[PDB]
Symmetry: D2
Subunit: 509 residues, 4 copies
């Protein structure tokens, strides 16, 4: 009754997937832990099974990866870049089937699944160039006959824990950068996206093996919280990049700090869009729609708070409602479908609870609010007005398509309301005012890691660094100098002079 055994889903075998798949890769494939079945959220049918990592699997994989690092760290960074280039090409070859798997197992629509693989392809191209560039300055020493250089070297083993919402691209961001920086990687993806993790690992493994490199350079140990906690506690995991909930990520950060490791934390968002009175409303409405209902509201960068100037609030809300009602719902792989299911049945439960807590806290559901009567985890995208900006349910991240709409009047108050939540990921204003734009970008503006103008809160490109502040965890991924998080800086002074130190009254020999 598995989908991978039906003729309609035969394309799954193009990714090398079968009925029961090995979920551990360290140069050899295996898995002696619990066997997990993952389900298609569009119909709740089982897709295939994955043999997860036992503790012994984890132990042997970490040892094999660090052994492989001895080889990988001796490979010049530009030649490491060549490997990442080939990974990029291998992803290009499978972009459609891999994107389809993302839609099938995770549940986002096909263009977003394909677009997510593109992000990995993109960062591969970026990292290839970066592999000729990473380093530090040679600085002028104040000492005659001395050189002063800043060196950068790999940290060693980078553990990468990822969430269900971006089950390819977040790993890819960490993988391409960590790789060209000379690290080996160990991946534990979200258990409900295990087939995606296995499929991505198969693509990378072939490139490694085809280049006669040890496969443990890009190791995989599928598992749940047990394997993730072990990574957080493991002194052999030199850097732990964690992407997920603030609640779990706070414990991961503490465990890593306890052992003086390095952590890279990419945690929750509660992202606000602010529409000022001079906003182009033909930009505001489609932008708010995509940011709120894209990926069925399950992006870290999803717009969950919509602030609209009181003069235009009612008009925007009425246009947004008319917009929501035109969204095409269906199977995420089907043509022209813009809205699919939530990732889990539990997510449907959380969705309903938040809607009820909103009405209790004084909110009015003006669109949606209910589960859809159809197979899968489909709920209606939801718009709630009338809450106070500081209502509890508005300050918590609910990973579901619920948009809280607030009125405002004053720029200073609404900037403060953007910043008042514990999260600090993304933020957008819609305005034409030149000075307001530069205030929003300045020290009294948005406190978030992503600070946008006249575009939504979601859909970043790879050239810049990606991440957030406050409870979002502080880590950065992808562009700018995010690579430095994957390496260790040393400040190096070389005395090449024959000059002796000042004897200071001591008679040396």
């Amino acid at each position: 009754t598995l989908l991978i055994n039906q003729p309609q889903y035969a394309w799954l075998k193009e990714l090398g997937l079968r009925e029961e798949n090995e979920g551990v890769y360290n140069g050899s494939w295996g898995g002696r832990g619990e066997v997990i079945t993952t389900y298609c959220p569009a119909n709740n049918e089982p897709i295939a099974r994955v043999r997860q990592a036992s503790v012994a699997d984890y132990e042997e994989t970490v040892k094999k990866a660090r052994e492989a690092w001895k080889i990988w760290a001796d490979i010049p960074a530009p030649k490491r870049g060549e490997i990442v280039r080939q990974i990029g090409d291998a992803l290009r070859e499978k972009i459609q089937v891999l994107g389809s798997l993302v839609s099938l197992e995770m549940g986002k629509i096909l263009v977003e699944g394909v677009g997510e693989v593109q992000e990995y392809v993109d960062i591969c191209d970026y990292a290839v160039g970066l592999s000729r560039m990473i380093g530090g300055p040679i600085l002028p020493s104040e000492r005659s006959g001395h050189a002063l250089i800043e060196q950068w070297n790999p940290v060693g083993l980078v553990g990468i824990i990822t969430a269900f919402s971006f089950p390819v691209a977040v790993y890819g961001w960490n993988n391409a950068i960590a790789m060209i920086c000379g690290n080996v990687c160990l991946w534990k993806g979200a258990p409900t996206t295990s087939l995606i993790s296995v499929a991505v690992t198969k693509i990378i493994a072939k490139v490694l093996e085809d280049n006669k490199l040890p496969g443990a350079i890009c190791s995989l140990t599928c598992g749940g919280a047990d394997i993730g906690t072990a990574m957080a506690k493991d002194e052999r995991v030199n850097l732990l990049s964690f992407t997920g909930s603030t609640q779990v990520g706070k414990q991961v950060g503490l465990m890593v700090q306890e052992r003086f490791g390095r952590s890279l934390l990419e945690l929750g968002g509660n992202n606000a869009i602010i529409a000022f009175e001079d906003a182009d409303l033909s930009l505001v409405v489609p932008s708010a729609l995509f940011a709120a209902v894209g990926t069925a509201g399950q992006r870290c960068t999803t717009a969950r708070r919509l602030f609209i100037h009181e003069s235009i609030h009612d008009e925007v809300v009425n246009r947004l409602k008319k917009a929501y009602a035109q969204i095409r719902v269906g199977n995420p792989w089907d043509p022209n479908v813009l809205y699919g299911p939530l990732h889990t049945k539990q997510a449907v439960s959380m969705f309903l609870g938040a809607v009820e807590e909103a009405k209790k806290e004084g909110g009015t559901v003006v669109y949606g609010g209910k589960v859809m009567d159809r197979p899968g985890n489909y709920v209606e995208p939801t718009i709630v007005t009338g809450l106070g900006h500081d209502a509890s349910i508005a300050h918590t991240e609910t990973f579901a398509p619920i948009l809280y709409v607030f009125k405002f009047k004053n720029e200073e108050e609404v900037f403060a309301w953007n910043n008042e939540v514990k999260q600090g990921l993304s933020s957008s204003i819609f305005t034409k005012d030149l000075g307001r734009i530069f205030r929003w970008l300045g020290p009294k503006g948005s406190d978030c890691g992503i600070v946008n103008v006249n575009i939504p809160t979601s859909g970043a490109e790879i050239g810049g660094a990606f991440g957030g502040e406050k409870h979002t965890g502080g880590g950065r991924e992808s562009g700018s100098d995010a690579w430095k998080q994957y390496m260790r800086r040393s400040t190096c002074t070389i005395n090449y002079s024959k000059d002796l130190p000042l004897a200071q009254g001591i008679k040396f020999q």
Copy 2:
């Protein structure tokens, strides 16, 4: 009996110090906490007293600094730079007396006390140029009609906790950089260097007042573990820079992580010098001496492990012995003194405890090992041979002048022995081999934040980032792009068109 009440120490009043000083500054001076008396470690006589911060003082001061931040962050960075330049000048004007106070209260010799103030002067002058440079790149967006810019803005309030060993310059590094980055600062120095903290704050306060700026931009709350723990748990302290022991730093790091704050940790070191067979011994011997015994072995960067190749181990030890004999010991102000007292009597007990462990773990004290029979906290600079590289006492940071000497044979093993400890601050090799030097600097080389060649472990100027790895805590101060730790990065996309192209070409 207070030294400040003796005419011999009247120069103290040139720093604004009195018998009883206020240890809280936030624009106004006060202090309702416990009154601490600090003592001169060269004679154990009381210098003067400082009224420390109560909880109410700390609450009041945090609030005033954060209000002051609203004014300060609005001042353009180059103009903040001009303030820091004036701080640099104000330190210059008092470098001799402030250096003397550092020698008096902390105990290092005058040239190091003066040189420590010069480090603060130097970072001011560096930060002035930086105040015109900080920012991020403008980047080419993949989308037409979009701008992509990386912005850097202040985090807000930078708490600064410092240790006794560098009671001026570590604060200075953090203050100069944090100020030009548009933050306000709150300083809690080591209790046993409270007068130094008050004196530095008096100097900065006059500059702020003279420029009609709120003095809380550089706030001070003298106190001990109670104030420091408050800062570590205080969500209003956006960045907590902590310089101190690994044991305390670990708890601070945990408390900051628990509240999703930012920390910059500068913790312990167990720094090694490695002398290969081809080393210039005329370079090795003085380098090792001044790295081991400088500041009476009380620097985070002090050389505590000396690895000498088998072929030259005996000669280097014999030459180092003959050199230790000529270390001139006296009061830290006595002209041409090289070696003063340890900071506390507890430091002496730790010194003796370590010498005793080393002798019982199989080491030989070839020089020193004894308390000096004189007033103050004086111990003999000490060299121990015969220990194994992995002896328990050698892997511990004993903050005292004990140099553990080891033999080695091969480059691979001694590199491993450098890296085998928990700390990761400073490291040095002495060699002429070109390949070995670049291997030391590379991915299979030293694992430390500071990686030196033919200079000891205290080779560090302000142009580079200063800090260590592993249990040293990972933070960086001073130069390179260390300033980014004092700011928050934003990635900013500006759509100035009338279109909505999505990243990665996604058609919704």
Copy 3:
């Protein structure tokens, strides 16, 4: 009869000037060339005299500068930075009197003379930080056991030729940056600002001599085109920085290219302000007046073309006329004066010819256009409407206060009209439209080196690189990575291994 021999001007002696001054400094003061008298342009009275450089003075000075380079290039950059810091302080000590000299000998108002000196002080402070920063990246070699480093090194002797309009700051920009980059300098300022060049060189000479450094590090050879041309042709002048007219700059650039030297050319401007229909007119009118009449229209960055959208053209012109009428004219050192003389009587003649030519090409003088009946080189600041944007006189740089005003309708054409002239220095639009601003800053916008929004064409700050494109010569000064022009880049590969892998995997 000489102003320096009068009591009202005895403050000139504070700069060490006397009746007849040596105009050559190379560690010794001298001058065997012609003795020039410089005159106060506000009253045409002689100030003092300067002995200029002969060819033999020049020859000896170049040799001594290059000899001093052997010592100076061996001084670490941060310590060269400290020298520049002290120059900054010495300038600070004399800022009021040196500014007064600038107003007296050159003719700009006092706030601008002091402002010009402040710019030199500012770049000194900037350069002190930069002296711990200059250098290049260490890059990852594609080859095992190889290091790849970008080194930067001084080019050697930097000759600096400057113009009358900024007789302190242009040299200061070049001097501070060239010095921290490890070069020696040789300055030939404008003959009509010789006393300014001497006064500045006296200040720097004192700093060098107090530091026991060879004075030829900052050499001076006062003279005219003969000395300037000798520099342009001299293989021993490794970099020639030239600030001046496009006509002379083109010949200098060719002479330097002929000998495969390096030139940094800062030439003429023909700078446009554009006011769109949505512009803040309370912002446009004062910005245009300052940019047009500041320095009596004698800045390279002076606004010389004003494009106004046809909807607001008449209103802006009328408002600008009302503001011109209130410009306060008088002695440039008088503290209430906004507008002083032109620098020379030939400048007045060129002004009159351009007004004449503007009338003959169909322009209307709506304000000014006349020489003033008073001592000194005073002309009325002038506004001309009615010329076509491509009128020949509008495309010429006349270094005088004549502002040509044009109507326009659409953004596309007025951006082209900004770009159509041969000059490429500075440019400004006034608008509120977000997209227009980013189009202005993009590849189809302004082609100038300075591209401003809602501020006039003049008054840049030192944090950015300063200079222009096209006939402005391409050079940059001051901020960003302008310092690279004063240094030579080397790409350095060091094989520290025992193998010889070849680039690109070539198996030979």
Copy 4:
């Protein structure tokens, strides 16, 4: 009779070459100028014909390129990078056969022809990443309410003139970087490598056309000095990159400077290897062999001067002689041939003339000196001893495999001898001495653009900047921030505040 019509050479048609080829590409293929036939230097047989550009072709091509720029500059840099990525893949798919054509028409051996194409692939990969990174800093303005940004924008049309010795990679370095920087390109390669220029342009033109882009973005006008001079004089050529002889480049540099254009000049080398007494001779001898005889001594980076310490001179020469006699000579496209012909018959004559001149000036031919007894342009790689370092022939660049060997004793003199020539391209020392290595890299060391240690003068990687100093012309290509030469910097201040300027007494 044409090689391309013999089945032996049928692989040439895989590059799209025919008996007669169009040598103009601007979206369409043409060529109404002189038809040239290029010859295989290995056997003096004609290969195929190329129709070169007439003046009318050149005119029409410049116009279409500048029209195409209006489209190309509006394409975001990352999307321009994606085109360059596809060019890289296109070159990958043709690397063996394109390199084979380089070997056939130019004459370098197969691994070098392939490696040259690999360089182009390498710079494509680099440029793709760079397309996400080009730009400047956002800087902190000293003024409240103002932003300060450094923008970079394309210059427009980049003319690229290249030499026969690297008929692929030099163009590739310029094309990939100029393309991602938003420029269009116009290529005029060496007439004797026209088939290579056509083959490369066919590869690129397919990529542009496949991406629905105007082909004039990468235009081609094959021609001689007349087309090259037109580009040098053409105001529409915003940047002219010229690679070739100092003699021609000097005139190109002066022509471009006359019109205030931009030039990037990559001219001759006279590169020296210096082997000190402590050198590893197992590295010296193979490195000198590859550097001197690679490409039959026809690289700008070829080693022409070999300085050997007196103590090891005779042994190194003896070992070099033995190494020379072992290289396999043959047709350069045959695998495992190590030594091919010179590029022209004239080059053979100039080789003989230089050998003759070396004998006249007192040199001894210790190896080689004669033409080889085989078809094609083959000469013996040649070693000359006994000349003085200042011998006229040693200071002339002769583009043939003649290596001049000199004795030296002292470091300072031999660095001076490295620096005494007019060229400043590449340089290398062989030594183990740490201090000597950093002095070589320092201000008193090599004056060249490429400063190597324990590797030869030739065979650079792409990650750093490539070029030289002095008569080498100063340009840089490829890595580091060489891309800035293909763009114009603007310093942009944006007043976003409502603050109106100070009235200064005027009633506005």
